[PDB]
Structures are given as C-alpha cells and as structure tokens.
C-alpha cells in the first residue's frame, strides 16, 4: 500500500543501544550495526510480507494484521509477534520471556521511518525508496 516497495536504509540512530537492551551480544551487534539493509514490503490479499535483506543477514516475515505469529528475529530470539495498522502506522510487538519490544513503521514524506523501543531505549531508522 503506502508501505509497498523496496526501501534502502539511509540513517540509523541508537540501534546499537537498542540491540544491547535486547541482550544481543557483541558479534551480532557488530553485524547488525554496520548492515545497510533493504526492506521489501509487499501485500497479497490478507497477507503482508516484509523481507529485510543485507549482505550478512536476511530475514522475512509474513503475517495477517491482528493475528499473532511466531518469529525468529535477526538476533535469534524466538518471539510471538503481532502486527496491527493504527492511524497509518504498522505497529509490531514482539513478546518473549515476559519482555516486549515495539517496532513502529510509518510513512513520512519520502521516508519509511522505523521506531524501535526496548525499555528506555528508542532507536530510529530511516529508509528511502531504492
């Protein structure tokens, strides 16, 4: 929809702190930090697919809005994820071991803005069309 497309990471703030707050170890944070992924968002019927592709790591999720699904994250957490659309924002929550983190995806001007929150840490990542 407004989200559909092939997006390239152009800026990131506080991603290392965000991964640290999630408990990600040094090697995986290193890989993640200097990744510059593409994010490819598509929709077919009820099903949204978000692929995140980079030289050292790829992930993919497919989901129906409002329906919980299992996910293995890029940092290898096994989580229960639910994604909803709220005022134009795709809101993802991941739940595991009594914790949660939120990842909000929104469209702003030419940007796909990704805000990731874990406890007191807020990370902002910005994608632009490829």
Count the site residues for ligand TXO by CB under 6 A. 18
Interaction between residue 24 and ligand TXO (CB under 6 A): yes
Distance in angstroms (rounded) separating the CA atoms of residues 51 and 59: 6
Here's the x/- map for ligand TXO, 28-67, by CB under 6 A: it reads as ----x--x-x-x------------x-x--x-x--------
Strand order in the sheet with 58-64: 58-64, 47-53, 38-44, 5-13, 121-129, 111-118, 99-108, 89-96, 78-86, 69-72
The verdict on whether residue 77 carries a ligand-binding annotation is no
Question: Which of 41, 48, 74, 90 contacts ligand TXO by CB under 6 A?
Answer: 74
Question: Which of 10, 14, 40, 75 contacts ligand TXO by CB under 6 A?
Answer: 75
What is the DSSP secondary-structure string of 54-123?
-SS-EEEEEEETT--EEEE-TT--EEEEEEEEETTEEEEEEEETTEEEEEEEEEETTEEEEEEEETTEEE
The verdict on whether residue 125 carries a ligand-binding annotation is yes
Interaction between residue 71 and ligand TXO (CB under 6 A): no
CB of residue 97 to ligand TXO, shortest distance in Å: 14
The residues that touch ligand TXO, with contacts defined as CB under 6 A, are 19, 22, 24, 32, 35, 37, 39, 52, 54, 57, 59, 73-75, 103, 114, 116, 125
């Amino acid at each position: 929809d407004a989200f559909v497309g092939t997006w390239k990471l152009v800026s990131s703030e506080n991603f290392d702190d965000y991964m640290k707050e999630l408990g990600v170890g040094f090697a995986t944070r290193k890989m993640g930090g200097m990744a510059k992924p593409n994010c490819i968002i598509s929709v077919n019927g009820d099903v949204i697919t978000i692929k995140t592709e980079s030289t050292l790591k790829n992930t993919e999720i497919s989901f129906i809005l409002g329906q919980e699904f299992d996910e293995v994250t890029a940092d290898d957490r096994k989580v229960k994820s639910t994604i909803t659309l709220d005022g134009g924002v795709l809101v993802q929550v991941q739940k595991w071991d009594g914790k949660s983190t939120t990842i909000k995806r929104k469209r702003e001007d030419d940007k796909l803005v990704v805000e990731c929150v874990m406890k007191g840490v807020t990370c902002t990542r910005v994608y632009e069309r490829a």
